[PDB]
């Protein structure tokens, strides 16, 4: 049971119904792997620095979670199956390192 | 890994007395726990040699501590071997 | 016969030859030139003067399509790159910007023995 952070970049061209279905599948897969959610930050569509999937923008999602480590990798694969989901990055949570303090 | 609760479990299990954290029995028990964990790690990932060296070092240390216990008090030596199930 | 009136200019400058390709803003070429298009045949193509001739010839070929303003793009470290730059800079064509887009790899492929002692 460690604390992780999930970054999900998906298609910015989705309407509200398809986006709701994508997020429903995300929540369902998180429940299926026992990932308690501590907080969420939905930043919406943003301008990428380079085109991803031939699209110059991307819709961002961020989830600070806590889950068993042994299936973390096994969870990430499940999130990459959806064609609308084009970027998935899971990172172990770390305390912030402040500079110029 | 090896969380602190399991470490305290084995320490309080093999403690000669409350407060003892460094007697020979405790050290050999901790080395045995780490050795079994590393052997289970090395059944898979059998191409990992840098950790196999650490396994060799831990085995040597446990053998030397058991030899010291054999020399000083063979009764606690037999008791430790019987409780842990070592030497085959 | 397209009457482009505005496009891009790619300059591929190498130690053996300098070659200019004048394209439209979408990248599709219109005309082009090089040291071999001019009478120069051998090593004289990797010359700054040959690069100037190639740039001016491509520019005059682009004048036939009635083009005025260009966007210059430089690729490759070769003799005569800046000379072709200065040739296109004052050639009747208006140079709007100069951009170096030399393709540098991230240590992907092993170079030839000529370019070894690196990666």
């Amino acid at each position: 049971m460690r604390r992780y952070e999930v970054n999900i970049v998906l298609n910015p061209n989705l309407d509200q119904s398809q986006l709701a279905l994508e997020k429903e599948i995300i929540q369902r897969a998180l429940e299926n792997y026992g990932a308690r959610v501590e907080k969420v930050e939905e930043l919406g569509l943003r301008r990428l620095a380079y085109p991803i999937a031939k699209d110059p923008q991307g819709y961002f999602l961020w989830y600070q979670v806590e889950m068993p480590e042994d299936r973390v990798n096994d969870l990430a694969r499940e999130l990459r199956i959806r064609d609308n989901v084009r970027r998935v990055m899971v990172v172990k949570s770390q305390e912030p390192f402040l500079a110029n303090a | 890994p090896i969380t602190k609760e399991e470490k305290q479990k084995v320490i309080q299990e093999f403690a000669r007395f409350p407060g003892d954290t460094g007697s020979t029995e405790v050290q050999v028990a901790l080395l045995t726990l780490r050795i079994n964990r590393l052997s289970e790690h090395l059944k898979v990932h059998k191409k990992d040699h840098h950790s196999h060296r650490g396994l060799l070092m831990m085995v040597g240390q446990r053998r030397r501590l058991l030899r010291y216990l054999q020399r000083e008090d063979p009764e606690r030596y037999r008791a430790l071997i019987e409780k842990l199930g070592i030497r085959g | 016969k397209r009457q482009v009136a505005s496009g891009r200019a790619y300059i591929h400058a190498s130690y053996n030859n300098t070659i200019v390709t004048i394209t439209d803003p979408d990248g599709n070429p219109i005309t082009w030139s090089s040291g071999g298009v001019i009478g120069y045949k051998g090593s004289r193509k990797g010359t700054p003067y040959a690069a100037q001739l190639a740039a001016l010839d491509a520019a005059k070929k682009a004048m036939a399509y009635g083009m005025q303003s260009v966007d210059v793009i430089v690729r490759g470290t070769g003799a005569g790159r800046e000379q072709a730059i200065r040739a296109l800079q004052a050639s009747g064509l208006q140079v709007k910007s100069i951009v170096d887009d030399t393709p540098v790899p991230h240590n992907g492929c092993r170079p030839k023995k000529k370019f070894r002692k690196a990666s």
């Binding site: 380079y50 970027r87 500079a99 | - | 910007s97």
Partner: protein
């Protein structure tokens, strides 16, 4: 000698391990998408070593570029 300005001194309080904050990490990239050296950032060894991995994370996420094109050459 890079006497123009130091990026750390030209900035305030910020998190070095935050890979999502773009408007701060953009200041640490050069005119190209390259990571600035120590002489430009004015950071220390540990700070630079953390900044490298965080910038790479932001690059993989698509927030920071891998490389850019030089202008006005």
């Amino acid at each position: 000698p890079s006497r123009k300005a130091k990026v750390k001194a030209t900035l305030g309080e910020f998190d070095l391990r935050d890979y999502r904050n773009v408007e701060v990490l953009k200041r640490f990239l050069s005119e190209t998408g390259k990571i600035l050296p120590r002489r430009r950032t004015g950071l220390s060894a540990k700070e630079q070593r953390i900044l490298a991995k965080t910038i790479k994370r932001a690059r993989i996420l698509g927030l920071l570029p891998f490389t850019e094109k030089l202008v006005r050459k």
